[PDB]
Amino acid sequence: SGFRKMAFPSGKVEGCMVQVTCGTTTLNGLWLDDVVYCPRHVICTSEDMLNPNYEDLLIRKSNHNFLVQAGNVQLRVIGHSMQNCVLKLKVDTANPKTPKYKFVRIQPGQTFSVLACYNGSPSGVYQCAMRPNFTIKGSFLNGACGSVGFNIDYDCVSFCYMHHMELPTGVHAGTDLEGNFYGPFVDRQTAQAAGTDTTITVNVLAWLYAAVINGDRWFLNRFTTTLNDFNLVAMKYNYEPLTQDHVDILGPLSAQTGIAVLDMCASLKELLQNGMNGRTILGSALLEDEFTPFDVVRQCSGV
Amino acid sequence: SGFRKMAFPSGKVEGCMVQVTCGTTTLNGLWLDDVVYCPRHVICTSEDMLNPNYEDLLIRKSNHNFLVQAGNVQLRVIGHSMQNCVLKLKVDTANPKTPKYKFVRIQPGQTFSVLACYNGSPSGVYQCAMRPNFTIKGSFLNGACGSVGFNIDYDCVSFCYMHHMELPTGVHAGTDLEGNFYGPFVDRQTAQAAGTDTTITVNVLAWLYAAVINGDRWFLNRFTTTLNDFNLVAMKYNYEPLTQDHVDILGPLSAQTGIAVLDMCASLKELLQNGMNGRTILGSALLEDEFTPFDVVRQCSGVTFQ
Ligand SMILES: *[C@](O)(C(=O)NCc1ccccc1)[C@H](C[C@@H]1CCNC1=O)NC(=O)[C@H](CC1CC1)n1cccc(NC(=O)OC(C)(C)C)c1=O
Ligand SMILES: *[C@](O)(C(=O)NCc1ccccc1)[C@H](C[C@@H]1CCNC1=O)NC(=O)[C@H](CC1CC1)n1cccc(NC(=O)OC(C)(C)C)c1=O
Numbered sequence: 001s002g003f004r005k006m007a008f009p010s011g012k013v014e015g016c017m018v019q020v021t022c023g024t025t026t027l028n029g030l031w032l033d034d035v036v037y038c039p040r041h042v043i044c045t046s047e048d049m050l051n052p053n054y055e056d057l058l059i060r061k062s063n064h065n066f067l068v069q070a071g072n073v074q075l076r077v078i079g080h081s082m083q084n085c086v087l088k089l090k091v092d093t094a095n096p097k098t099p100k101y102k103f104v105r106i107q108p109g110q111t112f113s114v115l116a117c118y119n120g121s122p123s124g125v126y127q128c129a130m131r132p133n134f135t136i137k138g139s140f141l142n143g144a145c146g147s148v149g150f151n152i153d154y155d156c157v158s159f160c161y162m163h164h165m166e167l168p169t170g171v172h173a174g175t176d177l178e179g180n181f182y183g184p185f186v187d188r189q190t191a192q193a194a195g196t197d198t199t200i201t202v203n204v205l206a207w208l209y210a211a212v213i214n215g216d217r218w219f220l221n222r223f224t225t226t227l228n229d230f231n232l233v234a235m236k237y238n239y240e241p242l243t244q245d246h247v248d249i250l251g252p253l254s255a256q257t258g259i260a261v262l263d264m265c266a267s268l269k270e271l272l273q274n275g276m277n278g279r280t281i282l283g284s285a286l287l288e289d290e291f292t293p294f295d296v297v298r299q300c301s302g303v
Numbered sequence: 304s305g306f307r308k309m310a311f312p313s314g315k316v317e318g319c320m321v322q323v324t325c326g327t328t329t330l331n332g333l334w335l336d337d338v339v340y341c342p343r344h345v346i347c348t349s350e351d352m353l354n355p356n357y358e359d360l361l362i363r364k365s366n367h368n369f370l371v372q373a374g375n376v377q378l379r380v381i382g383h384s385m386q387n388c389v390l391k392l393k394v395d396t397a398n399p400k401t402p403k404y405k406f407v408r409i410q411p412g413q414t415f416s417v418l419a420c421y422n423g424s425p426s427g428v429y430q431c432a433m434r435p436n437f438t439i440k441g442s443f444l445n446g447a448c449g450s451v452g453f454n455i456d457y458d459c460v461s462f463c464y465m466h467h468m469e470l471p472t473g474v475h476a477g478t479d480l481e482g483n484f485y486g487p488f489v490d491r492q493t494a495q496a497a498g499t500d501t502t503i504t505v506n507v508l509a510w511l512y513a514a515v516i517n518g519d520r521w522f523l524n525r526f527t528t529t530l531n532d533f534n535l536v537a538m539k540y541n542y543e544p545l546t547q548d549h550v551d552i553l554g555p556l557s558a559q560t561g562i563a564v565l566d567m568c569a570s571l572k573e574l575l576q577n578g579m580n581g582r583t584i585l586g587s588a589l590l591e592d593e594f595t596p597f598d599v600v601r602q603c604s605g606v607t608f609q
Binding site for chain 2: 128214
């Protein structure tokens with residue numbers, strides 16, 4: 001037992017990280033088979049970030065303008081291609097450490113591990129969620145661009161995030177590995193702001209189910225709720241609406257604990273009303289929303 | 304910016320993890336050079352666990368009595384030895400993925416990464432602190448024994464923890480890699496409990512510095528204090544004593560923020576007496592004590608591993 005924010009083991013991603021340099025700009029790239037993926041803004045100067053014309057900047061670059069270093073080794077760039085906001089650098093070597101991998105675009109509420117890297121070297125690994133406002137609450141300094149987010153369900157690495165920017169509230173925005181941004185953000189230094197963030201309701205419920213599996217029952221009550229009355233109350237606390245899909249997804253945890261999904265919703269309604277009155281749940285004094293139903297089952301019941 | 308509970312990258316350690324079977328028992332081992340390290344209780348069965356004679360149990364064992372699997376590959380065991388609560392299985396093959404490493408024993412308050420493993424396969428990585436009561440707040444299911452804790456410095460893995468047991472309250476106990484227990488625990492099925500835990504003061508102050516570096520400043524105040532004054536309030540609230548060495552270690556963060564440890568101790572003094580008054584610090588409603596001063600510097604300066 002016990003319950004922690006757990007990341008995936010990072011080794012399969014560590015062997016894919018490289019440094020990419022173009023002019024004065026250095027950041028991280030991801031080397032899978034014979035392609036290095038990195039943010040297209042590696043081709044920009046620090047002035048000329050307001051309104052970059054990336055098509056115009058890229059046509060002016062030679063293969064030999066990209067310095068790609070994997071440890072001491074310099075890789076040879078033999079071709080370049082832009083896909084949305086990602087640059088794909090063709091190199092003469094397939095990475096021999098390339099894992100079994102897929103690219104996946106995730107939905108808000110989904111969790112993933114981040115391997116924070118500087119100069120193509122790993123600094124640390126932590127767990128994140130795609131917020132409902134399509135930001136992530138990351139930990140990134142100058143040099144972190146091209147750091148990736150991933151899951152490893154079985155031996156297959158699903159890459160879902162590539163880091164590009166920090167927004168004014170100290171939260172982060174980036175793309176899938178096809179270079180499409182999460183949310184309405186652009187790779188320009190123009191004024192942009194995250195929408196109002198909301199709590200990931202289905203994840204809070206999953207985490208209350210974790211608490212019951214780990215033997216804590218103090219917050220339960222004798223009440224039930226309709227799905228609609230739950231949403232009318234939860235939205236007053238800036239909680240995301242709970243859908244019938246979310247109710248279906250919570251079915252297994254419901255069956256394991258013997259607590260109906262709408263009985264657990266009544267518990268959450270009372271927690272939002274009362275707070276915790278000096279108590280904690282799984283070591284937290286706040287309601288946790290960065291564990292998915294699938295994360296709870298994986299950590300509580302066998303991996 | 305941002306601040307997250309961050310683990311070390313686990314790749315150097317993932318290459319050392321193997322499965323060890325002795326009869327009915329499967330758990331994890333650590334394969335370094337030509338030796339596999341695992342918990343000595345791998346030799347025990349049901350009857351043995353209630354009062355084990357580890358000397359007497361280890362005599363009756365073949366080398367072929369220990370199945371060691373690295374992926375599909377069976378390693379050949381050519382020797383076995385016990386060191387305190389660890390078994391050392393000599394194999395005929397040096398691990399070609401052996402990193403630069405040493406074995407270190409950490410102090411209460413120090414943090415490390417755990418690579419939670421099952422059947423020799425890494426499943427997850429998270430950051431822990433050795434609690435003042437010598438437990439860790441881990442997350443471990445059946446099969447986790449022999450999972451290890453570590454720190455990295457440049458390209459050197461310091462192994463500090465090997466997992467042995469769960470206590471009541473769902474906290475965890477284990478050994479250093481020389482098989483010495485952290486805390487007053489024994490590797491037998493018997494009545495054991497975690498002692499009263501205390502809050503790691505120097506780590507809470509480190510995390511208040513992380514808060515300030517990230518623009519979370521509401522708890523700062525005009526007041527200062529001294530050790531004796533703060534420490535009399537610390538003991539009061541089941542906080543570890545703050546030593547002069549702690550004050551020195553936080554030195555850098557006092558400089559970088561303009562808040563002297565004792566000025567920050569004045570902020571922490573106030574938070575304990577008064578509470579947080581509806582507010583959060585770095586997204587927590589409680590005072591975080593599992594970041595060391597070094598962790599805060601590591602994270603807020605972008606230190607990388609080679
Ligand atoms: C990314 O480009 C990066 O890491 N680049 C390498 C590098 C940058 C700076 C110095 C040396 C090397 C960064 C990552 C950022 C930096 C701080 N934390 C991060 O997550 N991304 C950008 O700088 C990004 C590039 C834009 C998308 C194309 N960018 C540019 C300009 C402004 C901002 N944000 C900003 O001003 O943030 C506030 C909070 C408003 C100060 C930005 O992210
Ligand atoms: C460890 O031995 C292990 O993982 N063994 C492999 C295994 C395979 C299949 C089934 C069980 C075990 C475990 C690790 C435990 C299991 C669950 N969480 C853990 O951290 N350690 C023990 O089982 C340990 C071995 C003893 C020290 C030599 N042990 C034995 C008996 C009792 C407990 N604890 C206990 O009863 O915990 C409470 C909280 C009281 C239920 C114990 O840890």
